[PDB]
Design a protein around this ligand. Structure first.
Ligand SMILES: Cc1cc(CCCCCOc2ccc(C3=NCCO3)cc2)on1
Ligand SMILES: Cc1cc(CCCCCOc2ccc(C3=NCCO3)cc2)on1
Lengths: 273, 255, 40, 236, 273, 59, 40, 57, 40, 59
């Protein structure tokens, strides 16, 4: 492939460099339209800018935490982090978010990796290997109430059991209801006067719930869960302007008030170098 | 001039005619047939009394009144005393059979009411006591009398609550079982052909009933003004393709 | 590839792709045609 | 010795994975299968059998009576019943359809709603059933109702009427657990002319109503049902 | 495959929507019999509703517990949970149970996964890796009496040894005596007047027995066993009405007295939306 | 039983590696794709569209 | 070699090697030739 | 393989059920030598009673 | 596939499928026919 | 290095499984078999030989 062809002096009536940008086109002008060039080859394919590659590496999408401790006398397991959940979503952590929102609709399979590490803040003894249970709780399923409810039987709901310190990995097909996931949605769930506006209405993909299977030892053990997400088989439509201001909320476009100028002011003139 | 409506079933030395039928159901779309060798286990040649057992026995009649909750019969129990069918039953170790069930209830074009006629394979009843109380033998072997769902709880008997099918499921879903309605305005009989359904090729006829026939009023009986407020319901049932095997001394069963 | 000798040890079965509701939805003895009268 | 590397996920137990295992009972011979009528292959086979809907939900303890929709003689213009179409909740919820839908997260497809009339044979009636697609309110009078999917039913010799709620939707799947964006409409029924009883007859007549799914239907993404739970393991 | 064909106005003598439900049939009526439709395709196969899929994921079927402690002076090992057993059965935990009882007879191979996690309630030191032994004890086999009986030799009885914290997995062919397992049985084991009624009589598949192989350390260690069961090669006959009331017992259909109405009462009229 | 040896790196999680995984939702059927104008395949496709430069940065 | 049955479980996709910026860079209704005048 | 063949009434001079155990043999008598039987198949091979299986765990 | 060189290292043997009880059930010198008299 | 994943059950010992193992005595030559009357192949062969029943159990 040639990156530049050889081109010499020109004295024409045919001027490729004068255009009318009002038309909305970006005319494909090249170095050889306005200087004299020599042949050179590309030596490159643009492999690593493919959208599959761009969205295809694992990104941290969520960090939560649960603890193993005596539940005796706990009136609210959920509240003691005896188990915890996560209202699945991919917009909470914002590094991966800016990348996805370069597109309007996106379609992909997900590969999740879950790393779980333990911490023993209060001076301790022997730690017996804890086994985490991650179970997917889709919309309209008995949400779990204690850390050892019938829910955890999970007879119809996919769940994975792995050890703290290890990693769990599995992959979920594209579960969207439509043909693509909306990265943006300028609509409502119905024409009410006070119903929420955004995608949050569109993206209720249910929550994921974690717990330790082990009963309690004499000390307490903090287990912190990190969920990583990798898009595989990516398809993206309609590019948009990149995010300039900071994010404030999952699912709304809102930016913070009295934010700071995002364009760097010159130290000098327009004329400055 | 054949209508879905008029029918004749002749089986053995007995015939039934209905002039107001609503087709007939054949459970799971299969018609009763004898036991093939490829499916056989017991090495004994079986006995097939044919026409002496495969005829129509009419059980004693019930009375549908505005307060009726529904009735339940078990097979082969209901027939335990009918003619030679019954003798064969007590005398062989094993037996197998399909049936034609014909439920009858006629009224006039001023009455309203609708019965559900359903056959439930393996209808294990629940104790009204809860917990793990069992349902004694006698209670699940009412004979031709069947069980009257509007009778009182008894001790060691089953629960007789209709919205729960006598087992913890809702009346509304009984329609997943082969069934037919008798709607006075349409229908006057219900006919269901039952093929033999079991997890073994042949079984004992006394320790295990393999279907319960259930007739349940769903739209209450409503008679014309100053009519007598009740109608009789009659059940006639015929064993079909019956086979008995392992003949001997003659079972003695509780009560 | 089965690594094991017994059939119980193989993975899940593969879709019936059988599907015939008529034993449940139309167990009537005389065939009913949609469009023709139910009771003649 | 062949060189290997183990990946993330090694040693995990995923209740949904499908692999081979050693048999604990090497060489054992299972009992032969014999033929049994009734084999089920797909849950899609059974949700096409119709079952009764306790439409008359207004009672206070479960009763045979909540399956009966009453009809009044001589009323004109008025409304017989109304319900939204959240098949995973409300009237639908205990029906076989409702009960299976609850094992899945998403559903799509047409529903078949039929009404069987049980009044005396010498009576007569004309009813209108209307399906209102998502976007409008439950109709408030027949005029409103009749502008959407509807069937004038003429009560006759043929006892049942089968109304279909054709799949009307932007999004190709809806949630089985009730959700707004994903909502499916309303179903109402009104007198078209009115029920008329013959002489010597009196009182209310009832309609029975069934629900089953068209062959159209799709259910996906299995999950656990809110319809059953427990507090301690059972024992014998 | 078409999901709907195109159909237009109709003015016929042929009415597919009038039927007689008294017959017991559900006539196959479609949208196109009563409105004007356009062609649409199914795009779907019904893969995930196959009974193999429905019953084919692991469900928790049993949680038991045994402890490692000094048996010195224990008069009843079984009673000290020095080892414990389980009267195999699949109806004790009720999530998987409702799923199976949608059918009358069911036939399948089982794949068992056994997760064992340890707990050290009484403040402790170094935990030496415990090895669990699960052994299958079929009907008419010397039931074990102490945690270290000749029984555990298990010379003819399949047993698996795995480590606490790990998982054991193996698969057992369909061991039923008949052609299918009865999900229901309206019979007795014989015609006695007082013999139990149900399946329990039919489903005496023997018990499974667990123990720790390790002798005791200075502290005590609680090991809790969770058995998961996955049906593979499923065959199901005769669908039945789903379970509506709560369960009370393994193997009987009995429901609790003064249970609550299972059908939700309307907040409003029959006419309400 | 086939003899193996594990190499350095076993058990690591590299966010950039690309391998197979079990599907948590065996047999599930995704929604059909419909056509949507605007598909992007390479970031190289979009950086050829021109956009305005805030050249007058002096504010 | 796929070891798994479902398509979601396969590795990353492979390069589009599609690449056609004209939907974005030249969505004009009447075709513009470089070198010819922009507005005639 | 048949487990039992079909066999009917017999009135013979050929009695397979009378033997002399003093000989040391176990004569191979079957159900069909003394009752009327119907055909049935074995459906079974005797796999799990092979001595390799018996001593092999 | 055997991964090992020695025969002892291979898995269990496979069913004799030999089966001949006559060395045990009928070790008589003169053949006895069922149905013929035992002692002539 | 070929990428692997280990499944649940790894490391377990099931007394009934049947796999290959290294021989501790590489290259050893077992004693030749000679003929011995009486070989048994199936327990089904022997349960067809009749034996006496202590029917008179009353002692
Ligand atoms: C936009 C957009 C895209 C996504 C991701 C959707 C992923 C589908 C649901 O995700 C899961 C997560 C976890 C599990 C799980 N099953 C067993 C353990 O974890 C299943 C599906 O979220 N927002
Ligand atoms: C109905 C119905 C179906 C079932 C399951 C029957 C399973 C057969 C027996 O189960 C086992 C369990 C464990 C073992 C075992 N062997 C070594 C370790 O565990 C073998 C068979 O139970 N009820």
């Amino acid at each position: 492939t040639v990156a530049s062809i050889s081109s010499g002096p020109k004295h024409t009536q045919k001027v490729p460099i004068l255009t009318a940008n009002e038309t909305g086109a970006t005319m494909p002008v090249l170095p050889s339209d306005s200087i004299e060039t020599r042949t050179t080859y590309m030596h490159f394919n643009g492999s690593e800018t493919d959208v599959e590659c761009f969205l295809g590496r694992a990104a941290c999408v969520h960090v939560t935490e649960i603890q193993n401790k005596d539940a005796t006398g706990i009136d609210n397991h959920r509240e003691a982090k005896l188990f915890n959940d996560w209202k699945i979503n991919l917009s909470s952590l914002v590094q991966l978010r800016k990348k996805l929102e370069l597109f309007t609709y996106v379609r992909f399979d997900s590969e999740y990796t879950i790393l779980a590490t333990a911490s023993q803040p209060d001076s301790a003894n022997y730690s017996s290997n804890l086994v985490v249970q991650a179970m997917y709780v889709p919309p309209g399923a008995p949400n779990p109430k204690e850390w050892d409810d019938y829910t955890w039987q999970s007879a119809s709901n996919p769940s994975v059991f792995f050890k703290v310190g290890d990693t769990s990995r599995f992959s979920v097909p594209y579960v969207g209801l439509a043909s693509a996931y909306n990265c943006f949605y300028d609509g409502y769930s119905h024409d009410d006067a006070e119903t929420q506006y955004g995608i949050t209405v569109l993206s209720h993909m249910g929550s994921m719930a974690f717990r330790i299977v082990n009963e309690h030892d004499e000390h307490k053990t903090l287990v912190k869960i990190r969920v990583y997400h990798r898009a595989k088989h990516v398809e993206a439509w309609i590019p948009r302007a990149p995010r300039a201001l900071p994010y404030t909320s999952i699912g709304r476009t809102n930016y913070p008030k009295n934010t700071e100028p995002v364009i760097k002011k010159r130290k000098g003139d327009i004329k400055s170098y | 001039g054949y209508s879905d409506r008029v029918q004749q079933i002749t089986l053995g030395n007995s015939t039934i005619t209905t002039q107001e039928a609503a087709n007939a159901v054949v459970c799971y779309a299969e018609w009763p047939e004898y036991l093939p060798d490829v499916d056989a286990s017991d090495v004994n040649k079986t006995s097939k009394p044919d026409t002496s057992v495969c005829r129509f026995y009419t059980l004693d009649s019930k009375t549908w009144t505005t307060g009726s909750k529904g009735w339940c019969w078990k097979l082969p129990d209901a027939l335990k005393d009918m003619g030679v069918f019954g003798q064969n039953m007590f005398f062989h170790s094993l037996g197998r059979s399909g049936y034609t069930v014909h439920v009858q209830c006629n009224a006039t074009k001023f009455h309203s009411g609708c019965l559900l006629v359903v056959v439930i394979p393996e209808h294990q009843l629940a104790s009204h006591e809860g917990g793990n109380v069992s349902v004694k033998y006698t209670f699940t072997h009412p004979g031709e009398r069947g069980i009257d769902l509007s009778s009182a709880n008894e001790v060691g008997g089953p629960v007789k609550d209709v919205l729960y099918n006598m087992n913890g499921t809702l009346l509304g879903n009984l329609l997943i079982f082969p069934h037919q309605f008798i709607n006075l305005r349409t229908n006057n009989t219900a006919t269901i052909v039952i093929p033999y359904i079991n997890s073994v090729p042949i079984d004992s006829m006394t320790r295990h009933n393999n279907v319960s026939l259930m007739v349940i009023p769903i739209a209450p009986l409503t008679v014309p003004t100053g009519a007598t407020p009740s109608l009789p319901i009659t059940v006639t049932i015929a064993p079909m393709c019956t086979e008995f095997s392992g003949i001997r001394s003659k079972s003695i069963v509780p009560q | 590839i089965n690594y094991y000798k017994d059939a119980a040890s193989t993975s899940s079965a593969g879709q019936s792709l059988s599907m015939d509701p008529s034993k449940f939805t139309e167990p009537v003895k005389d065939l009913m045609l949609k469009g023709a009268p139910a009771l003649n | 010795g062949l060189p290997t590397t183990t990946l993330p996920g090694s040693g995990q137990f995923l209740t949904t994975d499908d692999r081979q295992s050693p048999s604990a009972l090497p060489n054992y011979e299972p009992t032969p299968r014999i033929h049994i009528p009734g084999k089920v292959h797909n849950l899609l086979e059974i949700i096409q059998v119709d079952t009764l809907i306790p439409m008359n939900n207004t009672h206070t303890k479960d009763e045979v009576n909540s399956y009966l929709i009453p009809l009044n003689a001589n009323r004109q213009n008025e409304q017989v019943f109304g319900t939204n179409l959240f098949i995973g909740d409300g009237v639908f919820k205990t029906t076989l359809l409702g009960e299976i839908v609850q094992y899945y997260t998403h559903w799509s497809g047409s529903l078949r709603f039929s009404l069987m009339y049980t009044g005396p044979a010498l009576s007569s009636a004309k009813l209108i059933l209307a399906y209102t697609p998502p976007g409008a309110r439950g109709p408030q009078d027949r005029r409103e109702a009749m502008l959407g999917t509807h069937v004038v039913w003429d009560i006759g010799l043929q006892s049942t009427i089968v109304m279909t709620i054709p799949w009307t939707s932007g999004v190709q799947f809806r949630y089985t657990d009730p959700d707004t964006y994903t909502s499916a409409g309303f179903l109402s029924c009104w007198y078209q002319t009115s029920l008329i009883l013959p002489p010597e007859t009196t009182g209310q007549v009832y309609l029975l109503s069934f629900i089953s799914a068209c062959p159209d239907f799709k259910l996906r993404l299995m999950k656990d049902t809110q319809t059953i739970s427990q507090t301690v393991a059972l024992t014998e």
